[PDB]
Each structure stands twice: as structure tokens, then as C-alpha cells.
């Protein structure tokens, strides 16, 4: 247990759109297992159903394809087609507002979800506490 236990409030009752404050980037599973982040709201691929496991441990699935947002071995966001010890991610409150999710099966390493300004994802050991790409907003669909 190396990590706070400052949860945000809100639900999973409903879908969301995973907004990056670093440059505006929605994320986005797309069918080919390719993840990334873009600007288009219309884009089909960008509506999330967020689930949770134990408490503060969430599920991260594409609404439109039923993959779910995963972290492999080396860092590296892909959509997987069934969930196994890498599709689970602490989902925690940071700087008393933002979402951050971290990398359950390499909690250890501080490995976060993020996304860089050109929309691109961020590798696992580039992210850390305290970077803009880690911070997210849950918004309506």
C-alpha cells in the first residue's frame, strides 16, 4: 500500500469522457487496440464506462468496442480484449480535484495514465506525481 487513499466522489453510473488538462485531449480506445487522445468530441471511441473492482480500483472500457484500457509490461496504454491483471487501475483524487489512475500491477513504480500535449499517450516510467498529463476530469457524454 504505497499510495494515498483520497478518492473522488462521483460514480459509475453513468459514462464519461476522460478529459486531459494537459492539452485539452480526450482518451480514446481505438478498435485496433491503438490508444491515444484527440480533441474531437464526436469521436466514437472516447465514451469510457468506468466499473470498480475493490474500492478505488476501477475497469476502464471503450462503451463502443468493449475493450478494456490496459498498461503493459513496459509502460505502454492498448486496448485489451478481456481483462486480466492489467486492465486495473487506482482511481484516486489529486490536488483536491483531478482524477489519476494508477497502474494497479505496477502501483509500485508510479505508473499513471496520461497524456502528453500532442495527444499522444505517456510510457509508464515518463509519468510521476505532479505532471499536468496525469491529471483528468470525468466529463459527461
Same mark, same amino acid.
Given at each position: 500500500?504505497?499510495?494515498?487513499?483520497? @478518492?473522488?466522489?462521483?460514480?459509475?453510473?453513468?459514462?464519461?469522457?476522460?478529459?486531459? $488538462?494537459?492539452?485539452?485531449?480526450? @482518451? =480514446?480506445?481505438?478498435?485496433?487496440?491503438?490508444?491515444?487522445?484527440? =480533441? +474531437?468530441?464526436? +469521436? %466514437?471511441?472516447? %465514451? @469510457?464506462?468506468?466499473? !470498480?473492482? $475493490?474500492?478505488?480500483?476501477?475497469?476502464?472500457? $471503450?462503451?463502443?468496442?468493449?475493450?478494456? @484500457? !490496459?498498461?503493459?509490461?513496459?509502460? #505502454?496504454?492498448?486496448?485489451? %480484449?478481456?481483462?486480466?491483471?492489467?486492465?486495473?487501475?487506482?482511481?484516486?483524487?489529486?490536488?483536491?480535484?483531478?482524477?489519476?489512475?494508477? $497502474?494497479?500491477?505496477? !502501483?509500485?513504480?508510479?505508473?499513471?495514465?496520461? #497524456?502528453?500535449?500532442?495527444?499522444?499517450?505517456?510510457?509508464?516510467?515518463?509519468?510521476?506525481?505532479?505532471?499536468? !498529463?496525469?491529471?483528468?476530469?470525468?466529463?459527461?457524454?
Amino acid at each position: 500500500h504505497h499510495h494515498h487513499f483520497n @478518492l473522488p466522489p462521483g460514480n459509475y453510473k453513468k459514462p464519461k469522457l476522460l478529459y486531459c $488538462s494537459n492539452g485539452g485531449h480526450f @482518451l =480514446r480506445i481505438l478498435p485496433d487496440g491503438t490508444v491515444d487522445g484527440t =480533441r +474531437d468530441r464526436s +469521436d %466514437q471511441h472516447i %465514451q @469510457l464506462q468506468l466499473s !470498480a473492482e $475493490s474500492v478505488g480500483e476501477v475497469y476502464i472500457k $471503450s462503451t463502443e468496442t468493449g475493450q478494456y @484500457l !490496459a498498461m503493459d509490461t513496459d509502460g #505502454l496504454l492498448y486496448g485489451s %480484449q478481456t481483462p486480466n491483471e492489467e486492465v486495473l487501475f487506482l482511481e484516486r483524487l489529486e490536488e483536491n480535484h483531478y482524477n489519476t489512475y494508477i $497502474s494497479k500491477k505496477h !502501483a509500485e513504480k508510479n505508473w499513471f495514465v496520461g #497524456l502528453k500535449k500532442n495527444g499522444s499517450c505517456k510510457r509508464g516510467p515518463r509519468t510521476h506525481y505532479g505532471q499536468k !498529463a496525469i491529471l483528468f476530469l470525468p466529463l459527461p457524454v
